């Protein structure tokens, strides 16, 4: 079976639609998500036209093997989609209506700059390669784009699922390709990060600052070094949920900055002890009293500066 | 092969049944479970009618390829089910009895609010899409719904496996869909959480309170900070077995609240030391004595309040 | 192809055999194991009978497609077995000898009560569903049941592989099922648990008891709290190799009991310090001296009681 | 279908091309990467020649089954590539133009000597085995070699994708093999290693050196041993992201060297304490003062020497 | 298609060869490795003989379906090999030359006694089952056994790939089986274990011995307990890379023995403190001075004894 022949010199328009049934497994490290959806295709094939009066039937059902079907592929998939044809219907004028249900692991880059307060635009790129007899061009049937109300992506809020209606037409190996961009806009449910990572991380930091109300070097060393090790455990925990980025994320910036605070608290604790041994406790008392104000104040201002640069 | 023709204007009724053979791998993080079951289907196709006198047999066996079979799909599966046809029996009136054995990874959301004392209703949604020639509607044969006595889901108790007998019939892409809800009610075996997470977590918390019977700042700092780090290890352990939820779980609430207790114990330990250095041990003694009662009392009342809000 | 016809009203006997080639991947958490074996089937088909004088041949080889073969399935498998037919031999009387090689992931529950000194009975349940024309019943050919001498299951000793010769015959969805139970008896190689978990766990416990020969609260607090944290690391290590059980395991019971010992050692260390501060060191000396005997004695007796309840 | 016949005694030239669509999952431990690309093949088959005047058509489309196609394989793949034929076009002279889209897990060794500041040359080796009737030789069509602009490999920068145009022609099992080398040059995005591993590791090292401004043995022991344990946690973290190499990596060398610094700081801390107890604090003061300069100076010079040997 | 008929009563000899293309994923825990190789087979089928004069052709190419091919299987594979036929060639006398490329996950036991200084002999067992018409026997064509020069097994050195030329002929389910043993001799690249596990483990052990030059119980307790916890972290790290063995490995023996050294150092530290409190520091000084020599001396001799028993 060959492609439908043109009346003039017009390309063949394959109208498309994607109806999401399931969204699952958004893997941040892999920058992938799994999708279960309906792919609907429609085009005119005059060779398939019939008279409903003469044939009796208003529509004709076909097996994929019996007719020409455009080879539609996904650009950003790991392996070719697992697809199962649901129906093929042909109106008297030869308008074919094809429907298949598929599943696919989609590869789509994520911007982690504002993590865990980030929003993403996931993409599903549909593509068709033209043949020598005909140039094939893709279109969007908006009445056939959508998602099931129950569609849930664990740890994310689905905002919208739309299609950029004008395809990106280009040459690849001296043949025309027509590409469509289906965009799934999502925003991360940041909630759990607050009681599990953010507040525990602040609590251990504030505990290290109790060393500014202590003259005991041994206890101070314990407070600052112990909490520093717990900070390292949180840094390791966070970086295991994320891929390695060539930029700084919001959480990464805070986590990094908090090390400087631990480092400066060790200097203070060291200086205090040194002065007391040198019989200068009055000078050490001045440094410790200033630290009580300076550490929370510089921490609050540094955080305002960071929140400003990132949001 | 086309669908069976109607006598009047009646939809074709495909009776269904699901008999569970195996339940395994309830993945809390993924919100999935694996199932191995029997899917039985039954419909009338009068085109398949036969006379046992003329044919010899009283029931005819068919290969799936030989006859029209309704395209029945699962809504909430990751990939299309692994299925193997066991039997296709046709009786003289044209009634077809179809039996297949399948295995599928089912995606079903879980409510972790009361974790690890939670119950869940797992769902298996069966669906059929109508054709232009006929509207296909699903029914439940209750005599064909059940589960093997040996069906065990590691770490869970299976309560019941029933079907909501009235299908959800609705429009989807200008065709009718008939959906059935099969519900597997389960409840978590909370037992192991007690000696492995809950009691160890309470023991280390009670150990931190021994600081209220000590005047040694160095020892108190070690007791409270060391046990706090062990609490962080339990928080990390717990959160690795759970997905990130946009709500607070019972365990999460307790784990979070216990940080406040560690934070306030550090303040007490700091205050006590400060007063002793300022030559006010009588005042410090009053605060430490009150803490001995206040900490267990507030811990018990806070826990009663939490158990009330969650149960 | 239809099933063989009966002479009288007798069921068709399908003689079975399982010869293990490989045993691997006993996953304790999943409660699964992987098997690579031979499945042999034997039944009589009179339609297939021939005279070896007239035909010349003593046996006839067949392709699966050419003859009727009973649909034999495994009950407790994750997915249907990956099978490859090795041979089909038909003798003059019509006795068919079928041989296939298969691989399957078998789901079989494990009793962890005596872990890591436990023995298990793994099961492979074979099943056949009867047809309308004939009732099919399973039998065991003992000469065709066995295992390769080289069959090794990493971390386990294989004791025996036998079959319960009488099938479980029962009705399921108004048809007869014939089920056979093939039992693989294994016992855990507990050896490695001794130098890697048990003895390290006892060493750190005995190290905490050195606090009974020390009057230094600061050092005592370090000894008891540090070793307690190492105990938590062993508890976490152990519980990651096991599924969550609605009962107590042997190791779990010991691990749990050892927490009580750490808790009571903290009370002793606290009491001793308190009395010394209250200028009562003679009383504290009496409690520490008793603890030196009481702690090992109660530890040994509690362990004897536990070993008795579990074995 | 047999291979095309030669005019003289010339080998059959199969022109090749690889156009990358997706690059993903560069697994450092496994030394593998996943690829989704176009494989284009072109050869002449005189048997397929036609007159475009007589046949009307300018090109002829074929199904793979209809014509002879060379068996082209990948050398360094885990399993055979998952391939789907896109097009087969035949010009009037008999020049066949074959295009397939494939996905493959490619096994390619990595040099970790300069990790995490390393560059790699990933290889995709194409091969063809000659037949008895004809010797098949591979060529590169440079116009059919390339990559999608959007091609991203998480944690890496793609520099170039080129082919070594001259094949490696060699005998293997008394038949000719023609092998082509497609090279994907990449360089690691080292950025994230700086705030997550390198700077945290230096901070804890500098914290241990504060012991050189302290006369408190107890505090010193805590500072040096605690930071040493945090170093061990970083060493373990790093070595889990890398395979075991029969050579030293850059990071490995630094991580190893830093242990010697911790070991010598423990000797210093021990010596100081010993002298103070022996009533020689003047001598200890001289050693501690020298260590304040010696430790950072030797650390800086040792690092210059290492950076020189590795870069 | 039936097997070739014998001239006399001679068995059918299938000559075999395995040429390794890729070796990868030697999983120590699973005791498996993945292989990508060529399997070549050769046998005589007189029914396939032709006159080169009459037919013109010197060799005849066949599709697997067209002729009888021996069912050759691998004994120690997880699942049946993924195989693709490269060529089937038939000389005029009827000698068939079959070549296929395959990939397989091979299950082969490993001896960890000398880990990480161990050598292994990996096995690939080829097998053929006899038929009633003929006894099929396997042979090795040594000119067709080998490996690609580029064959690399990450973390291992490949020494040789040879075949035990005489098959192990035996009865299995009343048919003769012909088995061949292909042996891949490898030796572990122990290098990385030295800077990553062995030297770090010795450094922390030597640090605990600095307690023998200290009279500070509090500091001693910190030194010995902190380093002991780091030893536990190394024990856990090592045992995660290895399966549980019913014997002691070299590393396991050293790791275990080092616990006894930590235990005895705690006794010494305890004894020293006890004597000082009892006003016997002269006696404690004698024990501490002896320990300075005794601990390194007993450590060196115990290690010589262990190296002797294991090598
Ligand atoms: C009378 C003192 C009360 C202390 C209350 C402290 C509340 C801190 C609120 C944290 C909010 C988030 C942040 C650092 C907290 C250190 C507190 C040290 C207390 C020392 C007391 C000295 C004795 C008079
Ligand atoms: C250490 C201190 C860490 C504090 C975290 C600050 C979070 C923040 O600043 O969050 C920022 C996000 C903003 O969401 P947005 O859509 O990206 O706004 C984009 C705005 N533009 C388009 C103008 C740039 O606000 C939230 O989610 C609100 C909840 C914050 C809870 C913090 C609890 C602590
Ligand atoms: C005579 C002292 C007996 C102590 C018994 C302690 C029982 C604890 C029961 C916990 C049950 C769960 C919870 C905090 C426990 C701290 C106990 C501190 C003891 C201090 C002793 C002072 C010297 C008189
Ligand atoms: C820190 C302290 C943690 C204490 C844990 C309290 C558990 C609890 O409150 O458990 C609650 C569950 C209730 O089960 P339910 O079916 O959800 O009751 C639903 C009731 N409605 C329908 C009326 C809302 O009771 C159990 O499982 C009993 C065993 C508890 C053992 C606790 C050991 C400690
Ligand atoms: C003279 C003292 C010898 C000590 C020998 C200790 C043997 C322990 C054997 C463990 C077997 C498993 C179990 C607790 C061990 C604590 C020992 C504390 C020693 C204190 C010494 C006091 C000074 C006289
Ligand atoms: C903390 C202290 C932990 C001590 C562990 C006790 C082990 C035990 O009691 O082991 C019990 C097992 C028994 O094997 P069984 O087949 O189940 O006997 C079943 C008997 N019936 C049928 C009569 C009930 O004996 C062993 O494996 C022997 C080796 C023990 C080594 C322990 C090293 C320490
Ligand atoms: C007056 C003292 C100021 C100290 C400033 C320290 C800056 C360190 C910069 C690191 C940058 C990378 C590196 C070791 C840091 C140890 C500092 C110890 C300070 C002791 C003070 C003694 C009292 C006079
Ligand atoms: C502990 C101290 C660790 C210091 C790390 C030094 C890094 C280095 O030396 O980095 C080396 C790489 C070089 O890149 P190259 O392409 O391999 O140069 C090859 C040159 N030839 C061909 C001449 C041999 O420079 C970078 O990436 C620059 C960024 C370094 C940031 C370091 C932050 C701290
Ligand atoms: C002046 C003392 C120099 C000591 C140098 C020690 C180097 C050890 C080399 C290890 C090689 C492997 C092994 C134990 C090391 C402990 C050393 C304690 C030093 C105490 C000094 C006392 C004050 C005179
Ligand atoms: C704690 C101390 C640990 C010391 C480790 C000793 C290693 C050893 O003894 O290694 C033994 C292996 C031997 O190799 P083999 O082939 O098995 O010799 C078999 C000999 N027969 C056939 C005679 C039995 O030598 C090596 O790899 C040499 C490198 C050792 C480096 C150690 C660095 C530290
Ligand atoms: Cl696709
Ligand atoms: Cl263009
Ligand atoms: Cl074009
Ligand atoms: Cl489905
Ligand atoms: Cl099965
Ligand atoms: Cl390939
Ligand atoms: Cl095989
Ligand atoms: Na088609
Ligand atoms: Na059908
Ligand atoms: Na059959
Ligand atoms: Na301490
Ligand atoms: Na072909
Ligand atoms: Na064959």
Residue numbers in the entry:
A (entry chain A), B (entry chain B), C (entry chain C), D (entry chain E), E (entry chain D): 5 to 315
Task: List sentences quoted exactly from the publication behind this structure.
At present, the best structurally characterized pLGIC is the G. violaceus ligand-gated ion channel (GLIC), of prokaryotic origin. Each subunit consists of an extracellular domain (ECD), predominantly in a β-sandwich fold, and a transmembrane domain (TMD) composed of four helices, labeled M1–M4. We instead found that proton activation is a complex multiple loci mechanism, with the key contribution stemming from the coupling interface between the extracellular and transmembrane domain, with E35 acting as a key proton-sensing residue.
Among the other titratable residues of the TMD, neither a mutation of E272Q nor E282Q produced an overall significant effect, albeit a significant negative ΔpH50 was observed for E272Q, which was previously reported to be nonfunctional when mutated to A. In contrast, the mutation of either E222 or E243 as Q or A, as well as H277Q, all produced significant loss-of-function effects, pointing to the key role of these residues in activation. Mutation of H277, which lies in the adjacent M3 α-helix (nearby E222) with possible electrostatic interaction, has also previously been shown, using noncanonical amino acid substitution to decrease the pH50. The structure of H277Q was performed and was also found to have no apparent deviation from the apparently open pH 4 conformation, which further corroborates the several previously published works that show H277 does not appear to play a role in proton gating. Mutations at both entrances of the ion channel, E243 (outer ring) and E222/H277 (inner rings), as well as at the middle of the TMD within each subunit four-helix bundle (H235), produced significant decreases in proton sensitivity, but again here, the pattern of phenotypes does not allow discriminating between proton sensing and gating. E222/H277 might also contribute to pH sensing, implying in this case the diffusion of protons from the extracellular compartment, possibly through the ion channel itself. The functional results indicate either a sensitivity to protons or a structural importance for both H235 and H277, neither of which are crucial for proton-elicited gating of the GLIC.
